[PDB]
Design a protein around this ligand. Structure first.
Ligand SMILES: *[C@@H]1O[C@H](CO)[C@@H](O[C@@H]2O[C@H](CO)[C@@H](O[C@@H]3O[C@H](CO[C@@H]4O[C@H](CO)[C@@H](O)[C@H](O)[C@@H]4O)[C@@H](O)[C@H](O)[C@@H]3O)[C@H](O)[C@H]2NC(C)=O)[C@H](O)[C@H]1NC(C)=O
Ligand SMILES: *[C@@H]1O[C@H](CO)[C@@H](O[C@@H]2O[C@H](CO)[C@@H](O[C@@H]3O[C@H](CO)[C@@H](O)[C@H](O)[C@@H]3O)[C@H](O)[C@H]2NC(C)=O)[C@H](O)[C@H]1NC(C)=O
Ligand SMILES: *[C@@H]1O[C@H](CO)[C@@H](O)[C@H](O)[C@H]1NC(C)=O
Ligand SMILES: *[C@@H]1O[C@H](CO)[C@@H](O)[C@H](O)[C@H]1NC(C)=O
Lengths: 431, 427
């Protein structure tokens, strides 16, 4: 039931009217700029004829204002757990020769674990010096060597794809009701223009986008849906962050393949003579997914999965940061039709006084056909002219007051048969 | 239950004996280096008399090897949660003028929250630009300003003290049984000597400290004991680590006091026009305490709360990384007199072959009073002499074999006789 959220009068300088003895028609030629309607509501342009009762409206409903994520970088991740094997040798036995233990290389497997065979899994190798001497079962008093071989294994049989958006492609869908009542639906992009019955329409300025977009990233769970993540995409594994372990494919997460990348020192070890514990404290990306699972709101946007060919989209919820440029190409409009009555009620009066922006008055208007409500205050200094329709709509325009305390009686009608309406509110002063 | 884990023989170098009359007496003079016995077990020195039936033992038990934490730096931490207030003003209204919102400073309270007034709590302030225009209730198309005031509040009425150990004080406690059998208990620090009836005992080498001590820290939960944390202490508050929020006291943590220090950006915000959510993802220090609550074992050590005092200690579990220097002040020992027989079962053989250290035989000995066990085992090559003790005790000594698999055979005669025994093993 929203009607005009934004309403401007076409400049007298783009309008020319003539009367054919009682029958008057006007031509629009030139350009008007109007802010796009808030989502669900209309941007409206009012045409005035020569008489005060000659009014027509062009209405442009913002059906939706959508932003589609163009995906940039991507990696796969999932959940992992370490499995360790250990074997302790006394000083001067096996590899536990003078310095080997303390200079042990991560990628070298100890002879102690040659029975494990070949591996293509993410893995690492440690040696921890432990106590020597007879109390720890060694003939030699020097430190014994706890050799350790560890591999990572996927804890789930599914994986998650983390990505960013390099661009958000704006599509503004508009439902246009011409002056003559004909309805059409169009869509526009930032650089688009469409021919209309009266000329053309384009986006003069389009600043629709995701503010702080570099601080969002997304997760896809294949066959399930998407999640938002409230952090920038990480191009490098960083311990304690999503992506600290990452792979180039879904299957490589699942097999924990050695091509996967990982941040250093993710596995902690507690060597205890012949006992060993190894643990991880990894970010659980399935928890992160469930925390951000779509749909979600951030700022004035709703992020949701695309219906159909899948990706993520964001929808504006309120204002649309775009101006429509309306080009009229010598287009004729008449004022034909019988007026019917309307009922109206005051809704609100909001904004400032003695300012350029003025104050927005909103009325609920109920009728059985298309027309115009006209209202004036006692002294004819203020006038309201708003669309009337079959059914009920909330309709708003700007009024200019010079006082913060407003209590103004208007008489309104759609057919000349006036009824009272009280507009009141409190407006702020600017500086 | 365990006896001599380390057995050395008194060097003929520091030994002089003779038989002038009705019996034989021996004199010990000089130093003798011996490895400390494993905790609970004994380091042992055998005195060889001029006969074969003449043998005496000096026994030194390791009762405990103990390391006490000398606490260094400390901080208090606990559990916190944010509470935030918000108020949005349209562009050109109130404080919301280009370009103050985007320039807002954490310490500056917005005039939107005058009704909160005076505070000594941890707190911050933010401003977030949000949609403008009539669709977001504003007469101006420029961004509106969501002003936010947030304070941290304690979510638990208890705190935790995180602390560091700048040094670990070593005390070694030895129980000495002299050749004549008199018992004695001494304590040694890393530098220390103690005099004995026969001379003295000193810590020659002492490496009983905590390896990797730089990567440990500790927590005290007031009146509930201690925990070990498997990471360094840090004097810098960092996000995602214990102490990311820290204070100087129990009360300050509980009041979420403004003197508490905190790492940057711990509170996250979701501005949603007129709605706002604010959250933290702080590590829970009480979970950290729980997971590390003492007693805990690391390496060859048990970390535990001090028994007769306040603080934490670590106790050596296996080998003691220390050499004992024994000094003998021209000390005389006699051998009188008779000694019975005992039940000795073979236990094991362990070591290498054709090496310096060699094999180590261990026997289970149950006997009368205190005696000495001999073995006619492999006579003309090998012999075994060990302490017989009133009770059940395992006794070990060194042996040199130059073959891989050892299948040996012994008739042990401490009696002398009457008994048999077998020994078998491999390197
Ligand atoms: C003074 O009065 C005016 C007019 O009443 C108020 O403006 C109105 O504000 C409301 C609440 O924010 C807006 O409602 C929103 O409507 C959108 C529109 O969605 C579309 O509308 C149809 C209704 O038939 C819906 O069923 C569809 O979903 C469709 O998408 C909706 O998405 C929001 O959830 C919300 O309901 C309304 O659009 C707006 N009207 C106009 C003409 O702009 C104004 O807030 C008020 N000011 C005050 C009280 O200070
Ligand atoms: C060979 O046999 C000997 C039997 O004496 C074994 O030596 C013994 O080893 C164990 C440690 O595994 C020790 O037992 C322990 O006692 C301490 C202190 O009381 C306690 O803290 C431990 O929990 C455990 O109960 C024992 O001290 C030690 N004996 C001696 C004399 O040193 C040796 O391990 C055997 N080797 C084998 C079977 O391979
Ligand atoms: C281990 O890494 C070193 C250093 O890059 C490399 O030279 C060597 O080939 C690797 N050794 C393996 C895989 O055994
Ligand atoms: C807040 O930060 C500003 C910027 O330096 C400073 O002027 C002000 O004194 C600070 N407030 C304090 C220290 O309480």
């Amino acid at each position: 039931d929203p009607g005009c959220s934004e309403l401007i009068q076409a400049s007298s300088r783009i309008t020319t009217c003539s009367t054919e003895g009682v029958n008057t028609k006007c031509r629009l030629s030139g350009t008007a700029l109007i802010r796009a309607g808030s989502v669900g509501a209309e941007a409206c342009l009012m045409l005035k004829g020569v008489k005060e009762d000659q009014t027509k409206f062009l209405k442009i409903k913002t059906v939706s204002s959508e932003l589609s994520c163009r995906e940039g970088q991507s990696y796969w991740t999932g959940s992992f757990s370490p499995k360790c094997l250990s074997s302790r040798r006394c000083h001067l036995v096996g590899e536990c020769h003078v310095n080997r233990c303390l200079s042990w290389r991560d990628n070298e497997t100890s002879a102690e674990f040659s029975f494990v065979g070949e591996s293509t899994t993410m893995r690492e190798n440690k040696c921890f010096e432990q106590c020597g001497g007879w109390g720890c079962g060694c003939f030699n008093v020097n430190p014994s060597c706890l050799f350790v071989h560890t591999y990572l294994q996927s804890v789930r049989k599914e994986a998650l794809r983390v990505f960013n958006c390099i661009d958000w492609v704006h599509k503004l869908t508009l439902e246009i009701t011409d002056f003559d009542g004909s309805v059409s639906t169009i869509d526009l992009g930032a650089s688009s223009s469409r021919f209309t019955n009266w000329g053309s329409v384009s986006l003069s300025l389009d600043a629709e986008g995701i503010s702080g977009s570099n601080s969002f990233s997304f997760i896809e769970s294949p066959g399930k849906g998407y999640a938002i993540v409230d952090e920038p995409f990480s191009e490098i594994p960083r311990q304690g962050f999503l992506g600290e372990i990452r792979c180039n494919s879904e299957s490589s997460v699942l097999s924990a393949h050695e091509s996967c990348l990982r941040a250093p020192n993710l596995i902690s070890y507690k060597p205890m003579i012949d006992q060993l514990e190894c643990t991880t404290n990894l970010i659980d990306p399935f928890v992160v997914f469930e925390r951000g699972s779509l749909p979600q709101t951030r700022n004035d946007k709703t992020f949701a999965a695309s219906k159909g060919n899948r990706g993520v989209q964001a929808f504006s919820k309120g204002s649309v940061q775009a101006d429509l440029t309306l080009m009229f190409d010598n287009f004729e409009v008449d004022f034909v039709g019988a007026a019917v009555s309307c009922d109206a009620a005051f809704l609100n009066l909001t904004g400032c006084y003695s300012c350029n922006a003025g104050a927005r008055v909103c009325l609920s208007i109920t009728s059985t056909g298309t027309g115009s409500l006209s209202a004036h205050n006692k002294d004819g200094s203020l006038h309201i002219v708003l669309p009337s329709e079959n059914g009920t709509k909330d309709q708003c325009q700007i009024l200019h007051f010079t006082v913060p305390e407003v209590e103004e009686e208007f008489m309104y009608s759609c057919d000349g048969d006036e009824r009272p309406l009280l507009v009141k509110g409190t407006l702020i002063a600017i500086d």
